[PDB]
Amino acid sequence: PRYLKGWLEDVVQLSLRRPSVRASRQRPIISLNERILEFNKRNITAIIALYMRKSPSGLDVERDPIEYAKFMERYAVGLSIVTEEKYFNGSYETLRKIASSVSIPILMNDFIVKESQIDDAYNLGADTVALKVKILTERELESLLEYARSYGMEPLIEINDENDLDIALRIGARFIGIWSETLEINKENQRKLISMIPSNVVKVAGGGISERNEIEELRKLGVNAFLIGESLMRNPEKIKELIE
Numbered sequence: 001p002r003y004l005k006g007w008l009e010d011v012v013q014l015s016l017r018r019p020s021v022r023a024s025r026q027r028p029i030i031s032l033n034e035r036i037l038e039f040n041k042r043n044i045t046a047i048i049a050l051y052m053r054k055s056p057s058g059l060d061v062e063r064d065p066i067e068y069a070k071f072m073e074r075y076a077v078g079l080s081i082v083t084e085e086k087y088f089n090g091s092y093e094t095l096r097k098i099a100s101s102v103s104i105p106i107l108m109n110d111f112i113v114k115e116s117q118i119d120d121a122y123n124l125g126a127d128t129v130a131l132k133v134k135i136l137t138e139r140e141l142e143s144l145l146e147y148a149r150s151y152g153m154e155p156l157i158e159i160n161d162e163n164d165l166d167i168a169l170r171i172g173a174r175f176i177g178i179w180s181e182t183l184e185i186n187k188e189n190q191r192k193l194i195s196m197i198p199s200n201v202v203k204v205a206g207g208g209i210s211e212r213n214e215i216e217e218l219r220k221l222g223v224n225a226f227l228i229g230e231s232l233m234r235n236p237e238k239i240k241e242l243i244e
Contacts, residue, residue, distance in 0.1 A: 001113050001135050007087075011111050012135055014086055020116040021092055023123045025099075029152045032078045032105035032128045033175040033202045036225045039077050045215060045243040047075070048107065048204065049236075050229030051098075052082035054089040058182050061233040068236060069098045075239045077225055078105035078127070092124055099125025107156060111135055115147050128153045130177065133164040142171040156204060165193055169201075179206035181230035194221050212242055 001012050032048070039046035049072045054060045065081075072079055081098055083090035090110070099106045108126035112118060113135060121129045131144055141157070148155040157173040159165045160180045168176055178193045180186075185207035197203055205218050206227030215226055231238055 001140065002137055004135060008111075008135055011084065011087065012113050015084075015111045015113050015117065018085070018117065018120075021120050021123050023096065025123055025125045027125070030103070030105045030127050031154065032107055032156070033154045035105055036077055036202055036204075040224055044077075045219075046077035046225035047232075047239055047242060048078045048080050048225055048227045049076045049232050049239065050080045050082070050109070050206075050227055051233070052088050052090065052109075052229065053094070054087070055181075055230070056087045058230060061230070063233065065094050065098055066101055068233075069102050071236050072232075072239070073102040073104050075243060076104060078107060080107045080109045080130070080227060080229075081126075083108055083110045092120060095121075095126060096124040099127075112144060113140070115144070118144065118148050118151065118153075122151050122153070126153075128155055128175075130156045130158050132158045133167055134158075134160065138167050138171065141167065145171060145173065159193065161189075162193065162196065165196055169197070173201065175202045175204075177204040177206065177227065179227065181206075181208045183208070191221060194218075194223060209242075210238070212244065215242060 004012055036046045051065055081095045082088045083095050095108055105127040108121035108129045112131055154175045156175050156177045157168045158177045159168050178190055202224045204225045204227055205223045209226055209228045210231035
């Protein structure tokens with residue numbers, strides 16, 4: 001990993017020692033980036049609903065993950081399940097139960113630093129994974145990207161600054177997420193990063209979306225899909241208004 005100090009270093013050291021799983025996924029991959037493009041083609045707002053048991057930086061919203069996932073199956077383009085175990089109180093088993101309970105694409109949202117975590121995501125039923133540029137060197141990123149692709153997964157490459165975006169574009173990312181959810185989002189940085197991405201890359205924006213107008217303005221800048229957590233975590237049926 002990159003030079004890291006503090007909380008990210010602790011998360012990365014934990015990830016390096018995370019036990020790999022022995023399980024077999026029972027269904028093929030349902031492509032998240034391809035589904036987003038199909039929603040775009042049909043003028044259907046594409047929202048990836050985020051699920052996390054604990055919000056380290058916000059208030060926790062405790063709710064049943066299965067109840068949440070089955071309801072989202074009807075509306076979301078996909079689900080993003082936070083599996084980081086110590087600070088987000090995630091669980092590979094939660095990911096597995098959700099992936100075997102619904103038929104929409106599932107993204108495993110964690111801090112990936114070793115190939116076996118991609119193996120874990122795949123074996124548990126996830127359809128893709130997020131790769132965070134901020135904890136990886138350029139060479140690690142290119143290697144993990146190819147490793148994910150060898151399973152048939154186009155990972156979501158997460159960036160929050162221009163330096164990381166350049167790295168993502170240089171290694172050939174085709175699915176990019178832009179974000180650093182109750183606090184104030186730096187809209188200028190987000191719009192700047194979006195403007196630097198080629199139109200053929202599927203772009204996902206996240207931040208504090210809670211209103212249809214916010215989504216409409218981002219759509220006008222070319223954003224393909226939206227990652228929404230807190231607002232849906234609190235009131236899941238708000239997604240009906242957001243895609244109306």
